[PDB]
Design a protein around this ligand. Structure first.
Ligand SMILES: Nc1c(O)cccc1C(=O)O
Ligand SMILES: Nc1c(O)cccc1C(=O)O
Ligand SMILES: [Fe+2]
Ligand SMILES: [Fe+2]
Ligand SMILES: [Fe+2]
Ligand SMILES: [Fe+2]
Lengths: 174, 174
């Protein structure tokens, strides 16, 4: 059986789900219960966390522009996702997607993580660059598992305190 | 490190590789040695085999139209990939992609198969629908492993002989 339904027009689907590809929801998964996790991500959404994904992530910036803040070779770097760009991120490259534009839309494809393969979410100190805090999770929902984790970091001056310089990370807005 | 390079413009990439998204090559893999197998498939290409993929396959028909001949619930069915359509195929649904249009381009995303998880390629009898022949392979190249297998089926009246009605399958062109 075609468990995931028939083919359907992607631009029209993005149009119809416009009102969720904006705050407060921002992403929307296309099919449920599949191995390939297929999502569209809109904007604006800025965020302060770096994701450590144990598997690859594929990006295709269909509409508008975005960029990824990265740690590469130990240094902060920015990789732009200009409209029309595709990109494949190797496992464990730390990335913080920045999506400043309303009406933008990025196809993002990931895989279900097998039991025991954990995702990391991390924050770094703006002053000294040291790691401030890391939570690891067995990720079951690329949409619903992230926020509670981000909320417990914003709520805690303890978790936000840099262990190297003692600066308290700003928390929600950089 | 960004093992797979920086983001890059996908339409321009498809344009530049136009001359391989036509006979005799027809598909082109975007990145090498990755877990996600990311390919663009052009046309025209018709084929007679049904693929039994042990993992999911994602389709996004960027340019032009195509269709997939399927076996679903035991019956031959056609699922159209109209320009703009996306589609997710569950594991083991038999599919024979038909790509009649020159200049067409379909993004197809699959996963590397772990050792021991085999792909099947099958042919069915036009007269009685019975399975005529099946080869299983440990697939390492979504481009180079298929043709030798198709060639050994076209070359063999034995492999093309339906075991139920005795009709010899046409082989290369339906
Ligand atoms: N790359 C992302 C991820 O793994 C989860 C949620 C959103 C994104 C994104 O690019 O915005
Ligand atoms: N779906 C395909 C596959 O698994 C291998 C090669 C080509 C295709 C296609 O859609 O044409
Ligand atoms: Fe991510
Ligand atoms: Fe610090
Ligand atoms: Fe296939
Ligand atoms: Fe037959």
């Amino acid at each position: 059986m075609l468990t995931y339904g028939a083919p359907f027009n992607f631009p029209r689907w993005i149009d119809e789900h416009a009102h969720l590809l904006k705050p407060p929801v921002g992403n929307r998964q296309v099919w449920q219960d599949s191995d390939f996790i297929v999502t569209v991500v809109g904007g604006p959404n800025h965020r302060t966390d770096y994701h450590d994904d144990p598997l690859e992530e594929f990006f295709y910036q269909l509409r508008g522009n975005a960029y990824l803040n990265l740690w590469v070779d130990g240094r902060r770097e920015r990789a732009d996702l200009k409209e029309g760009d595709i990109f494949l991120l190797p496992p464990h490259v730390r990335h913080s997607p920045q999506r400043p534009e309303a009406g933008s839309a990025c196809l993002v494809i990931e895989r279900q993580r097998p039991a025991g393969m954990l995702d990391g979410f991390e924050w770094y100190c703006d002053a000294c660059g040291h790691l401030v805090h890391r939570v690891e999770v067995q990720l079951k929902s690329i949409v619903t598992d992230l926020p509670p984790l981000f909320e417990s970091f914003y709520a805690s001056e303890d978790k936000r305190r840099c262990p190297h310089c003692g600066q308290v990370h700003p928390g929600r807005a950089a």
